[PDB]
Design a protein around this ligand. Structure first.
Ligand SMILES: CC(=O)N[C@H]1[C@H](O[C@@H]2[C@@H](OC[C@H]3O[C@H](O)[C@@H](O)[C@@H](O[C@H]4O[C@H](CO)[C@@H](O)[C@H](O)[C@@H]4O[C@@H]4O[C@H](CO)[C@@H](O)[C@H](O)[C@H]4NC(C)=O)[C@@H]3O)O[C@H](CO)[C@@H](O)[C@@H]2O)O[C@H](CO)[C@@H](O)[C@@H]1O
Ligand code: CA
Ligand code: CA
Ligand code: CA
Lengths: 128, 130
């Protein structure tokens, strides 16, 4: 069971924003609704999110970043990016932007983009 | 830097928007996000005074970004800060009474009242002045 306007998928609820904001404000926006900028835990979830993103032609932020530009990607839950997910980057990605780097769903895979760019976002929280 | 969008009011470096439509608390939170704002999180007594005057003169019940949804009795602002002991004085007499389970805060008369989150109320957004 999920709140109205939230999507249920494999035990979790996902909120697809209908507006755009920078990565930081997106992290904040999800906490406002007792959720978290989506942290992908399984390949099934990734396929699901990538699909929703591509069908709506909307570049969307996920809770993954390398704010120090040290090439060290971490999820907002504190966990690191497993090498198993490195395959989700689009061709040539991730290419540092020269500024704080954040991950976005773009077409078929993920892109590295500047964190202050305005993108749609996706929040996630357990179903009830 | 005291510039605000049309229909928004300025006070101490921030812009406030009072809605003309009504939505439940949850939808109000997301409504403010759509306009690059946040359901009002009150940080100072002075701000509370400014807002209570605006709301009482409009004669409307309006949502603020405060709730005790996570833990009944412990109020939290949507920005992650807890309701301070000093701000508890703003609840109207006899409130919060959790009548039929009320976990969202609204401006009501001269102070605040907890109401059911699924109730349609006007709302107030806040964002930095530019
Ligand atoms: C006279 C005046 O100042 N008018 C102002 C007005 O002031 C407010 C107004 O409130 C009138 C009622 O408005 C709504 O109906 C409710 O907010 C109601 O409160 C009860 O119901 C809500 C749920 O709908 C509860 O959240 C609330 O706690 C309260 O519940 C009742 O609580 C008692 C005590 O525990 C309990 O015994 C009852 O069973 C319970 N009832 C229910 C339904 O649960 C308001 O009473 O007038 C009040 C004067 O007495 C003021 O105190 C209010 O602030 O504000 C507007 C806005 O500016 C202004 O235009 C108007 O002139
Ligand atoms: Ca409750
Ligand atoms: Ca309550
Ligand atoms: Ca009440």
């Amino acid at each position: 069971h999920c709140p109205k306007d939230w999507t249920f998928f494999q035990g979790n609820c996902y909120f697809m924003s209908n507006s755009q904001r920078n990565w930081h404000d997106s992290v904040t926006a999800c906490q406002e609704v007792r959720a978290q900028l989506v942290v992908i835990k399984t390949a099934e979830e990734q396929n699901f999110l990538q699909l929703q993103t591509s069908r709506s032609n909307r570049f969307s932020w996920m809770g993954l970043s390398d704010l120090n530009q040290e090439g060290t990607w971490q999820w907002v839950d504190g966990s690191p990016l497993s090498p198993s997910f490195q395959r989700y980057w689009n061709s040539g990605e991730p290419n540092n932007s020269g500024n704080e780097d954040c991950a976005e769903f773009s077409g078929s895979g993920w892109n590295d983009n500047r964190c202050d760019v305005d993108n749609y976002w996706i929040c996630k929280k357990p179903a009830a």
